[PDB]
Amino acid sequence: DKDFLWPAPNEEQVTCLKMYFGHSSFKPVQWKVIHSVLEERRDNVAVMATGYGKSLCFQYPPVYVGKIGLVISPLISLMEDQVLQLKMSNIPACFLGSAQSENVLTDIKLGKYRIVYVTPEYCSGNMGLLQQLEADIGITLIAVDEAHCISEWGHDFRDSFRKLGSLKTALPMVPIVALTATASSSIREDIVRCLNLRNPQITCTGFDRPNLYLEVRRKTGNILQDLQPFLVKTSSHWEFEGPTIIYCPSRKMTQQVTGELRKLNLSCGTYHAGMSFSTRKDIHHRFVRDEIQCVIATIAFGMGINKADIRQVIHYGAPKDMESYYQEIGRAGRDGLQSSCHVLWAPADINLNRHLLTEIRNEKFRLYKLKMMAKMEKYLHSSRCRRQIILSHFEDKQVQKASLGIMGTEKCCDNCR
Numbered sequence: 469d470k471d472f473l474w475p476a477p478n479e480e481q482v483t484c485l486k487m488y489f490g491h492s493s494f495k496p497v498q499w500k501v502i503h504s505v506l507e508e509r510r511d512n513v514a515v516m517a518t519g520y521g522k523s524l525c526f527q528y529p530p531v532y533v534g535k536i537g538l539v540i541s542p543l544i545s546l547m548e549d550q551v552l553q554l555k556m557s558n559i560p561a562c563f564l565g566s567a568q569s570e571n572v573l574t575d576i577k578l579g580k581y582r583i584v585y586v587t588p589e590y591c592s593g594n595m596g597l598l599q600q601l602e603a604d605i606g607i608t609l610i611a612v613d614e615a616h617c618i619s620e621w622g623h624d625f626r627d628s629f630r631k632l633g634s635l636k637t638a639l640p641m642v643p644i645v646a647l648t649a650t651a652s653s654s655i656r657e658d659i660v661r662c663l664n665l666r667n668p669q670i671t672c673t674g675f676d677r678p679n680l681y682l683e684v685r686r687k688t689g690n691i692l693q694d695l696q697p698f699l700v701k702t703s704s705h706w707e708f709e710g711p712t713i714i715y716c717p718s719r720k721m722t723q724q725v726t727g728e729l730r731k732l733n734l735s736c737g738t739y740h741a742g743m744s745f746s747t748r749k750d751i752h753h754r755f756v757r758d759e760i761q762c763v764i765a766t767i768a769f770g771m772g773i774n775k776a777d778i779r780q781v782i783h784y785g786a787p788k789d790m791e792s793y794y795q796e797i798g799r800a801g802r803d804g805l806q807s808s809c810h811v812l813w814a815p816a817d818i819n820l821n822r823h824l825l826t827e828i829r830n831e832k833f834r835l836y837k838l839k840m841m842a843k844m845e846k847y848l849h850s851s852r853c854r855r856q857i858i859l860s861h862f863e864d865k866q867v868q869k870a871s872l873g874i875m876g877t878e879k880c881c882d883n884c885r
């Protein structure tokens with residue numbers, strides 16, 4: 469479990485997790501948030517469907533470094549429940565408010581508490597307190613739960629969240645972890661703007677995505693022969709069933725593939741590292757406008773596409789690894805309508821070529837890259853449920869419990885069919 473994280477949690481981080489939280493391992497997304505907070509001091513928008521595996525992301529870092537973490541939330545009963553859990557785990561924690569202040573505030577200032585829960589109403593009155601705690605202790609992170617409540621445009625607006633924009637003014641070097649259940653690109657942008665987040669890490673987890681069909685199929689090598697099954701012949705030209713992305717492992721392939729689809733007069737365009745920002749922009753704009761149907765691309769394309777109606781993702785060549793693959797298929801069917809994700813792989817794919825990783829001189833990184841390639845190859849070669857493999861590696865056990873409906877049916881994956 470620890471072998472698939474970059475960089476690997478050290479031995480004292482694992483010991484800390486076991487002692488204080490009772491867990492043996494970090495899930496990749498949990499590690500993604502914790503490491504970015506601890507080492508990069510990086511702002512996060514962590515979209516989480518449920519509270520399962522959620523709290524660790526903001527509770528673990530201040531416990532590990534033995535400093536202080538702030539959790540800003542309006543969910544009073546849930547905050548009280550979490551304060552009791554932390555206390556019962558021998559983590560010193562409290563609810564800080566006007567009524568509680570006499571009991572706790574001197575102790576908070578003296579650095580006796582790892583985790584302090586506050587309402588957004590209390591926080592806007594006490595930016596001076598946070599400055600003192602930053603100076604005297606050092607604030608590992610500020611968590612803003614129900615972060616969607618800052619957006620006037622969302623369904624559950626709270627005026628109390630408006631003044632949380634000042635956190636980055638008052639405390640420009642403390643990273644903010646914004647947490648919400650809503651996967652709206654619109655609300656994410658509102659959260660980023662209203663909390664003044666700087667280049668935030670965006671993750672989205674806890675969702676089972678029942679509308680994504682998964683298939684792995686052997687690649688002949690003949691590009692037209694390989695992609696012919698996906699095409700529909702109109703009087704004018706051949707075309708895909710809907711908005712499509714074809715992810716290719718190199719820039720040489722993106723040209724080759726686009727060349728073969730060009731011969732069919734298919735409305736498509738190439739994207740890669742080595743193209744004009746102006747051309748990349750109109751591709752992005754045409755795709756969003758539905759002026760080109762398909763996009764042939766490298767790992768470069770997809771981040772902040774926000775396009776809800778991607779019906780088909782094809783990996784023409786084995787993906788880089790399971791992390792990139794997860795990001796790439798995650799962009800399919802955000803509208804919640806039926807989408808398909810196909811891998812077309814051969815044994816001669818660059819991303820299954822060990823020789824290139826054998827030549828990497830940094831040993832810890834070499835052994836990570838080989839372990840990730842092998843995990844990818846074990847997914848592609850599997851006869852077991854494609855969905856079960858992906859949820860098991862990336863998602864909390866709760867996501868698998870919810871997903872038992874789709875799993876096993878003719879719409880789950882090629883192996884369940």
Ligand SMILES: Cc1ncnc(C(=O)N2CCC3(CCc4c3c(=O)n3nc(N5CCOCC5)nc3n4CC(=O)Nc3ccc(C(F)(F)F)cc3Cl)CC2)c1O
Nearest residue numbers: 651670672675676677770771772794795798799802855858
């Ligand atoms: C601005 C920005 N900055 C950085 N990066 C990206 C980016 O390009 N990405 C970041 C987000 C990704 C990554 C993960 C993921 C993404 C995503 O947009 N949505 N939208 C949903 N839906 C929307 C509709 O309501 C329900 C949830 N859920 C997600 N998820 C989770 C997911 O898809 N989990 C999953 C589950 C099962 C399987 C199966 F195969 F086992 F079935 C696969 C997966 Cl991946 C997309 C990439 C960005 O935009």
Ligand SMILES: [Zn+2]
Nearest residue numbers: 853880881884
């Ligand atoms: Zn399946």
